[PDB]
A = this chain, B = another copy of it.
Amino acid sequence: MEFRQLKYFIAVAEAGNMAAAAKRLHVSQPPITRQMQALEADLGVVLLERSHRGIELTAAGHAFLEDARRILELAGRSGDRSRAAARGDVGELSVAYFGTPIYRSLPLLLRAFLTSTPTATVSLTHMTKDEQVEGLLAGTIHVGFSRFFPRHPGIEIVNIAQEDLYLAVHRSQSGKFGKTCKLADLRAVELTLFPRGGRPSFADEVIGLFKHAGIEPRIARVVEDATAALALTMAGAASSIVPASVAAIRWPDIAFARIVGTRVKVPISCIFRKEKQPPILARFVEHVRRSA
Interface positions of A (Cβ within 8 A of B): 1-3, 42-47, 49, 56, 58-64, 66-68, 70-71, 74-75, 77-79, 81-86, 88, 90-91, 97, 102-104, 106-108, 110-111, 114-115, 121-126, 138-139, 148, 150-151, 193, 196-197, 199-200, 203-205, 207-209, 211-212, 216-219, 221-225, 227-228, 231-232, 234-237, 248-253, 276, 278-280
CB-contact partner of A211 in B46, B67, B212, under 8 A: B212
Smallest CB-CB A-B distances: 9 pairs: A67-B78, A110-B235, A107-B234, A250-B250, A63-B85, A208-B211, A60-B86, A111-B235, A107-B235
A42: B residues at CB distance < 8 A: 79
Copies in the complex: 4
**In whole Å, how far is A21's beta carbon from the nearest beta carbon of chain B?**
17
**In whole Å, how far is A234's beta carbon from the nearest beta carbon of chain B?**
4
B217–A200 touching, CB < 8 Å: yes
A122: B residues at CB distance < 8 A: 232, 235, 237
